[PDB]
Design a protein around this ligand. Structure first.
Ligand SMILES: [Mg+2]
Ligand SMILES: [Mn+2]
Ligand SMILES: [Mn+2]
Length: 430
DNA sequence: ATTATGACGCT
DNA sequence: AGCGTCATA
């Protein structure tokens, strides 16, 4: 009864930019605004590979991973922006720098966890307590929540979408008990008020729109965020979880989109997150391991304890290039030239990082893929990173991979390399 | 011939 | 350490 922990102690948000690389290009080039458009890398093979798609273009069925030539078949007027190429490779610097713009604004409200190039988690628990105490037990007006959806509402005893949003929000606000500063639903609501302010700040100061989820933990916040994209935010309350999860495919929950999620489905013969509640913690641990089992047992009840880590900066800096089909590297001079290209971009990014962030990387990881290999990486080797010098880093990388060459001849490289990867890791303050 | 990343888990 | 999983533009 009184001891049943409910995963209501925190207020957590996830803020995720809408169509992020597309918005970065639309800010730069006004001709692309409010149009079906996509961001592409490379051009020569099938028009290039799409990595971001505006919502206008999604209406035509354009998706990520699509070749631009194929996307053009669905959407003949599709506009395209190309990722920068430097030193023979795609260069994502413009988007990394746009990410920093957003992360710095978010950091003004609370400590954030950078979760990708375009999203961060926010622990709003403390901020919510402070806003609650200056609120003086005064009700929260719908006007403070102009882009907020309350998941699961309206319900019970208008055919426009905004009309439905407000009806749900009205039901929610009508039910609230603003008299209780410890009420989780109230805390989430004030959390949502703060996230409206955060999202307004991001749009004002960068031009970029975003969506957000507000709940009691990271997994629910992430799930919530996607429910009403673009340019809206969604509150998923603890009470909303049973209905939400009753028809929620297991794969939709973060970390269950791959082999583990498939195994949950196959082994237990279920489809939806809610169905997990009928297994004991020990049953789930028996199939999926101690850690996953306990996590699943709590997660299907809406409960998760993973903290929002205080980390705003990436903890690795890497450079990678595929060499597909007939472009695979088959000579020593080829392999060395591309290690140099990668190492030169890595040095540029590392030196910037050292100046900006007062740290130095101490380990260099080198990874390659060989033709025929089923996997992402065929081989990974580390060595010391002692100087921010591209020629040394590329020479060192070659030394660690030198023996992968199976050719008797040393001038040729076999089997040909289909991927090179340089990653700087193990930072120390400097 | 999706590509370029980046975090974290396992042994 | 090196490998595997899962994730996002
Ligand atoms: Mg996406
Ligand atoms: Mn996004
Ligand atoms: Mn994202």
């Amino acid at each position: 009864g009184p001891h049943m922990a409910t995963g209501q102690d925190r207020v957590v948000a996830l803020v995720d930019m809408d169509c992020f690389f597309v918005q970065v290009e639309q800010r730069q080039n006004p001709h692309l605004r409010n149009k079906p458009c996509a961001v592409v890398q490379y051009k020569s093979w099938k028009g290039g590979g799409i990595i971001a798609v505006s919502y206008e273009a999604r209406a035509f069925g354009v998706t990520r991973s699509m070749w631009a030539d194929d996307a053009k078949k669905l959407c003949p007027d599709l506009l395209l922006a190309q990722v920068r190429e430097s030193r023979g490779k795609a260069n994502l610097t413009k988007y990394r720098e746009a990410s920093v713009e957003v992360m710095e604004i978010m950091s003004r409200f609370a400590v954030i966890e950078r979760a990708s190039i375009d999203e961060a988690y926010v622990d709003l628990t403390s901020a919510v307590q402070e806003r609650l105490q200056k609120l003086q037990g005064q009700p929260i007006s719908a006007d403070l929540l102009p882009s907020t959806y309350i998941e699961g509402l309206p319900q019970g005893p208008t055919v426009q979408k905004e009309g439905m949003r407000k009806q749900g929000l009205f039901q929610w606000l009508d039910s609230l008990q603003i008299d209780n500063l410890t009420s989780p639903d109230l805390q989430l609501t004030v959390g949502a008020v703060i996230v409206e302010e955060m999202r307004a700040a991001i749009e004002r100061e960068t031009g970029f729109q975003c969506s957000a989820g507000i709940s009691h933990n990271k997994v629910l916040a992430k799930l919530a965020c996607g429910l009403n994209k673009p340019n809206r935010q969604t509150l998923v309350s603890h009470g909303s979880v049973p209905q939400l999860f009753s028809q929620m495919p297991i794969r939709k929950i973060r970390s269950l989109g791959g082999k583990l999620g498939a195994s949950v489905i196959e082994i237990l013969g279920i489809e939806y997150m809610g169905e997990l509640t009928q297994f004991t913690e020990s049953q789930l641990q028996s199939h999926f391991g101690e850690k996953n089992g306990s996590w699943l047992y709590a997660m299907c009840r809406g409960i998760e304890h993973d903290p929002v880590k205080p980390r705003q900066l990436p903890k690795t800096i890497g450079c990678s290039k595929n060499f597909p089909g007939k472009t695979a590297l088959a000579t020593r001079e080829q392999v060395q030239w591309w290690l140099l290209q990668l190492a030169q971009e890595l040095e540029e990014r590392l030196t910037k990082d050292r100046n900006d962030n007062d740290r130095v990387a101490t380990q260099l990881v080198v990874s390659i893929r060989v033709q025929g290999d089923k996997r992402l990486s065929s081989l990974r080797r580390c060595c010391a990173l002692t100087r921010y010098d591209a020629h040394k880093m590329s020479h060192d990388a070659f030394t660690v991979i030198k023996n992968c060459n199976t050719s008797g001849i040393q001038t040729e490289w076999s089997p040909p390399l289909t991927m090179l990867f340089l990653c700087a890791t193990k930072f120390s303050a400097s």
